[PDB]
Amino acid sequence: STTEDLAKTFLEKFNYEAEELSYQNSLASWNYNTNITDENIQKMNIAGAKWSAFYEEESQHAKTYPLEEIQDPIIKRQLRALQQSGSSVLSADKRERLNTILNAMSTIYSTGKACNPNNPQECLLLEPGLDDIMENSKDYNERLWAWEGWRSEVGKQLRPLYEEYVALKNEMARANNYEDYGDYWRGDYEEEWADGYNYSRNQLIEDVEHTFTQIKPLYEHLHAYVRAKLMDAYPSRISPTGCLPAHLLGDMWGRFWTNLYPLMVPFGQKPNIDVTDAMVNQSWDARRIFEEAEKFFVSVGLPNMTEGFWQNSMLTEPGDNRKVVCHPTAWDLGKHDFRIKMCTKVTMDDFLTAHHEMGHIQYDMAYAAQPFLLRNGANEGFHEAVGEIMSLSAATPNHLKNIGLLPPDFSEDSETDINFLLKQALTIVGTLPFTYMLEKWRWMVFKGEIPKEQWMQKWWEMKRDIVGVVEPLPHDETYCDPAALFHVANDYSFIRYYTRTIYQFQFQEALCQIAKHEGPLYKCDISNSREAGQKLHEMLSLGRSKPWTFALERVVGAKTMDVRPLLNYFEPLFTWLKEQNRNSFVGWNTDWSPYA
Amino acid sequence: LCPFGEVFNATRFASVYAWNRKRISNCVADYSTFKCYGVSPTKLNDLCFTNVYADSFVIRGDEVRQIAPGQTGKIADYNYKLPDDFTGCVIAWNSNNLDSKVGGNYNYLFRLFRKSNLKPFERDISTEIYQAGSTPCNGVEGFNCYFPLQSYGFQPTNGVGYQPYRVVVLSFELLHAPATVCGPH
Ligand SMILES: *[C@@H]1O[C@H](CO)[C@@H](O[C@@H]2O[C@H](CO)[C@@H](O)[C@H](O)[C@H]2NC(C)=O)[C@H](O)[C@H]1NC(C)=O
Ligand SMILES: *[C@@H]1O[C@H](CO[C@@H]2O[C@@H](C)[C@@H](O)[C@@H](O)[C@@H]2O)[C@@H](O)[C@H](O)[C@H]1NC(C)=O
Ligand SMILES: *[C@@H]1O[C@H](CO)[C@@H](O)[C@H](O)[C@H]1NC(C)=O
Ligand SMILES: *[C@@H]1O[C@H](CO)[C@@H](O)[C@H](O)[C@H]1NC(C)=O
């Protein structure tokens, strides 16, 4: 009797126990997020610790069926996921030391505070306090203390920790046969498959970089336009051929330029479409929104929400004694138990969010028949891409007409479209160079290409060169500014934010084709195209059972990441910016400094 | 006169692996899914049979598909098989309100492993450790050795296909013995 026999029957029994322990973890965690009590924190910890103990134990057992000896690729993909390994291969001392470090970092990020150099008793956490300054201030000096203070106080603490964290992760990664921690992380896009659905870890670098050069033009003109307006925002602070002072960019990092919008609004007298007041006047409540989001998905031929989804979801802030976490999320607890937790308000924003989050649930329902270990998006980027596609079509004036949040005789205003596409680019394309540059730095640090003595030096060389952003004050190697961002300090790969953005518009372009949409790529509304929803579902239901390259091909026709749809989405704005910049510089110096 | 209540409205059903059989003999019978294979249910109150066997267990919504002739699955292969020429009805209904509970109810089991498939209407209640590999278990679970039974785990929040369903499988028997089960005629 063959080793694939043993593997199949081992997995058959694991699936039952795993499904059960994992369901108890989901339930206890859900109990916390919808009722924060110290008792519930306890039940959440106790159950989550049971699940991870079970998993690591079973992950060792899964290793006794060598992958070489398995032929059926559905069993093979199951085992690869279970026997995927890390951190156990270290010594027990270094494994314990690593966790001490990851834990030190993660908590000094959520508790370190920085004090205003002029009001010493005003000491502000990031989480409510500095964040409010970096997202709402228009004062150069106020924004500067906050930005610099958080990077001198919280950042410098993390520097020796991050230093040692790099050493241990690389030891772990090479102990598992990867080149470095980065090569380990790029394994999340790897695929081992015949006839050209393979995808090598080094190709992710190849594809990320090649897509990025195509972005540079659109980013250059977005950059030139905001630099112009920001010059007006903060007169005599910004060079017109220079880079952007990092502390003026709209959040704590310049991760999203989206809060810069009211300083640079293209057509000030065409206020952006806001169906909030319509919703309030038609007496819509939270139930109505979600019903409407359900309607949208049926119209493309996807299922209704399960009856459990309506009993067990938490669609409003409970308003009794209970204390909750309001951040919208879409849970797949297991055992076809699907729920959304969201503190819904009657706003146009929460209307779109319900669509975005119900899209997550549709993905979850679609692959529920796959084996347990394969119930995920095709890779780390697919779930959010699918969610965002829904938010896109539901915001269009056409859909808003058909559901009567916009009068039937309403006519779209091309200037109002430019307003909307600018705000979109401030978020969507703004973040792409930020994201690519961060992971490139991280990836290089792990490879050993950047020495310790040049960490912050190459960081800002890359901020200046790639992102067109320049540090307002000089930072030596006493700083660890990349760790002053959550995902770095909390040890999370960052490239998903880049790939899922590119995936999202690949999906939407492919679906609007199928829906025989007429004009430009924004303004598209896949509503009522059962053909489009069905193509979507044919991939959604794959789970992780096929390589993501095949999964992408199932919807768009190529097995490749491709950024041309993103550029196509923004083509209207792209030509508008070009004409707006007839008398602006485009690109940046990389020599100019506020402090020079 | 027929005791269909104590098989349908029974408080505790059996585990599918140890499925229950009740012989119905010498009475009158007055008759969610309800699927018949050898006979028209609409004509049931008119017919007459020597014996009527009432088989009952619980099962997942997923698995109600398997209590039918010519089916394959853990349930049909390893717990309750119906013969290709089955002549009878499979009545099923959702029992979430009854057989699931907030902590999980785990008193319902099905056999997960067996060295061969059951013959039709065979029952197997052995609990011998299942040796999947060359090296023998010694009553000891693990190392390619498994406890043959597996628990269900019904909670009220599960999706429908994971919820408990109560099943009754009525077989109808025509021997040359005097028929003793009927309705009006
Ligand atoms: C999705 O659900 C709705 C209702 O929850 C279904 O619409 C019908 O709604 C009326 C009253 O609202 C009910 O009496 C009907 O039983 C519902 N069902 C049907 C089939 O009309 C809607 O049809 C559901 N969509 C799908 C694809 O099942
Ligand atoms: C896919 O594979 C192509 C063939 O290369 C050979 O096969 C693969 C599976 C490797 O094991 C390699 O060592 C072999 O030489 C590659 O040429 C091609 O670039 C690959 N494509 C991607 C996206 O990885
Ligand atoms: C919330 O938590 C408390 C104790 O942790 C518990 O008594 C209560 O039933 C829980 N649920 C709700 C809905 O309040
Ligand atoms: C018991 O069985 C009969 C079957 O016809 C049904 O009508 C009845 O409602 C069942 N339940 C009770 C509580 O009587």
Numbering used by the authors:
A (entry chain A): 19 to 516, 616 to 713
B (entry chain E): 335 to 365, 375 to 528
What did the publication describing this PDB structure actually write?
The receptor-binding domain (RBD) of the SARS-CoV-2 spike (S) protein binds its cellular receptor angiotensin-converting enzyme 2 (ACE2), thus mediating viral entry. It has been demonstrated that the interaction of a virus with (a) species-specific receptor(s) is a primary determinant of host tropism and constitutes a major interspecies barrier at the level of viral entry. On 5 November 2020, the Danish public health authorities reported 214 cases of humans infected with mink-associated SARS-CoV-2 variants (miSARS-CoV-2) containing a combination of mutations not previously observed. Sequence analysis of the miSARS-CoV-2 "Cluster 5" variant isolated from patients identified four mutations in the spike protein: del 69–70 (a deletion of the His69 and Val70), Y453F (located in the RBD), I692V, and M1229I.
To elucidate at the atomic level the molecular basis for the enhanced binding, we determined the crystal structure of SARS-CoV-2 Y453F RBD bound to mink ACE2 at 3.01 Å resolution. The overall binding mode of Y453F RBD to mink ACE2 was very similar to that of WT RBD to human ACE2 as evidenced by the low root mean square deviation (RMSD) value of 0.9 Å for the aligned 597 Cα atoms. A surface of 1668 Å2 is buried at the binding interface of Y453F RBD/mink ACE2 and is comprised of 18 residues from Y453 RBD and 18 residues from mink ACE2. Between mink ACE2 and human ACE2, there are differences in five of the amino acids involved in RBD binding: L24 (mink ACE2)/Q24 (human ACE2), E30/D30, Y34/H34, E38/D38 and H354/G354. We especially focused on the residue at ACE2 position 34 as it directly interacts with RBD residues including that at position 453. At the WT RBD/human ACE2 interface, RBD Y453 interacts with H34 of human ACE2 and the change to Tyr, as seen in mink ACE2, results in a bulkier side chain that may increase steric clashes and disfavor the binding of WT RBD to mink ACE2. However, with the mutation to Phe at position 453 in the RBD, the Tyr at position 34 in mink ACE2 does not face the same steric clashes. In addition, while the human ACE2 H34 also has interactions with WT RBD L455 and Q493, mink ACE2 Y34 interacts with residue R403 in addition to L455 and Q493. These differing interactions may account for the enhanced binding of Y453F RBD to mink ACE2. Mink ACE2 bound Y453F SARS-CoV-2 with a KD of 78.22nM but binding to WT RBD was not detectable.
